[PDB]
Amino acid sequence: GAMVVHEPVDMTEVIDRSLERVRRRRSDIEFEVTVTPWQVIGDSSGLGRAVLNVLDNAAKWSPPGGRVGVRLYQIDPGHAELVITDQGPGIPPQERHLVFERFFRSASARSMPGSGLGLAIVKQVVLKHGGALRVDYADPAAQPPGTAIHIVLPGRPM
Numbered sequence: 001g002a003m004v005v006h007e008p009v010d011m012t013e014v015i016d017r018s019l020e021r022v023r024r025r026r027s028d029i030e031f032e033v034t035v036t037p038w039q040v041i042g043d044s045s046g047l048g049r050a051v052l053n054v055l056d057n058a059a060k061w062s063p064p065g066g067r068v069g070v071r072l073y074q075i076d077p078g079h080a081e082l083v084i085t086d087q088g089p090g091i092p093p094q095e096r097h098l099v100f101e102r103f104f105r106s107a108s109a110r111s112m113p114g115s116g117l118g119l120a121i122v123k124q125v126v127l128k129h130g131g132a133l134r135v136d137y138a139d140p141a142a143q144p145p146g147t148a149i150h151i152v153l154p155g156r157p158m
């Protein structure tokens, strides 16, 4: 099967590389980045693909001048949580079980080119690294509430 890469991965570099790519596509977005140093054992290319796919969605559905939050904090001795947030329409509660399935398309989000594979890839990468993920509103009290993608990754503080 596909090569299984199991090497130390600096998540600060993974996120910084992913951000460089997407800042090009939407230079108006205010990316608010708060990343605690975190090392994951795995596949830097796969993790980079997963973070870029989430950042790409956050940018696509960001309003002009929108803020995208990119936050990674340790939550216990062996895990950290990456939360990527936008000020887009958000994904409503009833759809949150189609998110991460191939070919999902939200009726709340404006139709854009893309065939609905990015988040299925994210789920695969995160599971292959022993993580977990979920979707929620970024700020339920705000209009619009935005989407928050939450990714928990095992690893260690650097």
Ligand SMILES: Nc1ncnc2c1ncn2[C@@H]1O[C@H](COP(=O)(O)OP(=O)(O)OP(=O)(O)O)[C@@H](O)[C@H]1O
Binding pocket: 053, 057, 058, 061, 086, 088, 089, 090, 091, 104, 105, 106, 107, 109, 112, 113, 114, 115, 116, 117, 118, 119, 120, 147
């Ligand atoms: N941050 C977000 N804000 C609003 N809607 C989102 C967001 N992220 C994902 N979605 C919705 O979930 C769908 C699935 O997302 P996903 O990234 O898997 O597919 P895509 O972006 O349409 O295509 P691809 O990622 O394959 O280019 C999107 O088409 C969109 O309806």
Ligand SMILES: [Mg+2]
Binding pocket: 053, 056, 057, 114, 118, 119
């Ligand atoms: Mg996508």
